Amino acid sequence: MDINASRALANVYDLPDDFFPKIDDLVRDAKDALEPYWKSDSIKKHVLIATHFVDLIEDFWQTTQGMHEIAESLRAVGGSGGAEIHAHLKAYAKINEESLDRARRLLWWHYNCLLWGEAQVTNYISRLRTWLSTPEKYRGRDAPTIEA
Amino acid sequence: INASRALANVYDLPDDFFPKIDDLVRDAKDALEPYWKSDSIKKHVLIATHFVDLIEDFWQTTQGMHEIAESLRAVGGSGGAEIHAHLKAYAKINEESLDRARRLLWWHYNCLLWGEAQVTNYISRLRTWLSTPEKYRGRDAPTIEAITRPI
Amino acid sequence: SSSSHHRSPSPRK
Amino acid sequence: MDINASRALANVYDLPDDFFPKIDDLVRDAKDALEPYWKSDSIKKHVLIATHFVDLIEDFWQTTQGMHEIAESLRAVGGSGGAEIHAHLKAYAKINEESLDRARRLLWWHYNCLLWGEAQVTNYISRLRTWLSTPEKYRGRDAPTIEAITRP
Amino acid sequence: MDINASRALANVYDLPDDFFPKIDDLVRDAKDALEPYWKSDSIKKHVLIATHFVDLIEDFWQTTQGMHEIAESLRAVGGSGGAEIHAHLKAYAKINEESLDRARRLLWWHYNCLLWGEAQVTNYISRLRTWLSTPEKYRGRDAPTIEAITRPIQVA
Amino acid sequence: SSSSHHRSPSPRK
């Protein structure tokens, strides 16, 4: 495969939003794989970045989910609250969940690059892009995976 | 060792030592943009950039949560104290997270500009000066102009 | 650097 | 200064009971500075002594405070216990408080000597005694310190 | 230190409590054997630890004992203001007793290691634990000892 | 030319 075309086809924001493991499993794997580098106090790029995003998720994910739940409960219980309140709440939750989707994607990217290598990860992304462009019939019955 | 030490020192500060968030983010972006154009992977670059993004993403949402919670509680007739309590808890969590982000951003920005040593020494001196009981102190805090002068 | 890799992690497109 | 006069003016128990940080802060800083040596299972003087005194405080401080609380509560109640009971309890709490004050002072001493050096702390205490015997207006605006430094 | 010495000390922590000399005698002997190292201002592990533990005892032993005494006194006289009084007092005294028992045992270990040697003492304790855990009929009628004490001082 | 420092720590005066 052409390195150039691969790198051009590889981007973490192109993915379907269902390719990404649940946030709990992702955070757990990230922490369990980072513990050595933490204890060693390592200054590697992906270590630093994945640490930042682990912290970001742990901080704001449950708060955003609680905000969405609160907005729904407030619009359900009745109009006693208001429309501006629910609109502002939904907008804040929307912005936060966009930021959290970005954090999730980049945490995945950074963790997988730490494990395997960003070269392997971009190759995998390109090959998965192809697998997804192809129709179900003339492609593998199960998707690829890194060194798999 | 000394890294976590100076970090704990940074956390051991009064919250009135840290500039306003607008000034801080402005200065950080101004100092970092060249490094972005240069595609630099420096540690302080990595961390300050990511904290700037964090702040610009969540600060306004958190302040709005605070204000709307207080307003609807003053109203009193919207849902119940459950909503206000849930909102206060979330806002507290996000506030402490953003405070940590603000502090680490200050630390890394200043380390990048001037020097990690010049910032660590000043922070140690200031933390010591603040610890003491005001009778063995000096009567004049250490001022930030010490970072700017080399040694 | 052939890759964008700006502001540290991969930049959007 | 004259090194002899410095070492002679340097004694931890000369300080007026308020130069010393609070007990929680002191134990916390001591543990934070010790845990490396604890893990490395070190033998050195200051580590050993600071550890012993941390343990002593952890063990007896809260008990002594509770003893004082008990003495005051029984004093308020009046009929409970009695007079000589209150007297003996207060005397015991007082002896324990003397021991714990000595422990706090020695803990400060050894923690700081471990961080910087007992010579540095000696000079610090000496210069502080001098700077503190002088009146306020001829002191200046720069008290004495140790001022750790870092090199890139 | 050696895992042998660690085993010996962990065993000291769990001995029958009748193996240990009276605290008065222990403190006395510790002071008398340490004052030379005090004058010489030595910084040896056992010296430091024994000194600190004997000071600890000197300070808090009689205090804890009087605490017990007065707790029993208030329980006997009655008229307590709530039972929490005696509860908290005896809990404090119990924590003090645990701390002081550990102190006595480490003082014993360190003073005896100073006298004889860490090796001699850990061997002694290994033998004594093997002897105590074992039941009679396979044991020996007389316990083991540090043979350097009860061996004759021969002089021509 | 050494301080008291007896028993390992510093004594009173």
Numbering used by the authors:
A (entry chain A): 1 to 81, 122 to 188
B (entry chain B): 3 to 81, 122 to 193
C (entry chain E), F (entry chain H): 250 to 262
D (entry chain D): 1 to 81, 122 to 192
E (entry chain C): 1 to 81, 122 to 196
The study reports:
The low folding propensity of the extension domain questioned a direct role in capsid assembly. The corresponding protein, DHBc_Δ78–122, was virtually insoluble; however, solubility was drastically improved by the additional mutation R124E (DHBcR124EΔ). Sedimentation, NAGE and negative staining EM data all indicated the formation of orderly CLPs, prompting a closer look by cryo-EM image reconstruction. The resulting density maps at 3 Å resolution revealed the same architecture as in the wt DHBc particles, except that all spikes remained narrow as also confirmed by the asymmetric analysis. Difference mapping confirmed that all density differences between full length and internal deletion variant localized to the extension domain which therefore behaves much like an independent internal appendix. Notably, this helical framework forms independently of the extension domain. Of the extension-less variants only Δ78–122_R124E produced specific though weak signals.
Particularly striking is the much larger size (~260 amino acids) of their single capsid or core proteins (CPs) which in mammalian HBVs comprise only ~180 aa. DHBV CP (DHBc) expressed in E. coli self-assembles into CLPs which package bacterial RNA. In line with earlier data the major type of DHBc CLP conformed to the clustered-dimer T = 4 architecture known from HBc. Confirming selective aspects of evolutionary conservation between avi- and orthohepadnaviruses, the new data also reveal unique structural modules, including a direct contribution of the very C-terminal residues to the capsid shell and a centrally inserted extension of ~45 aa that behaves like an independent folding entity.
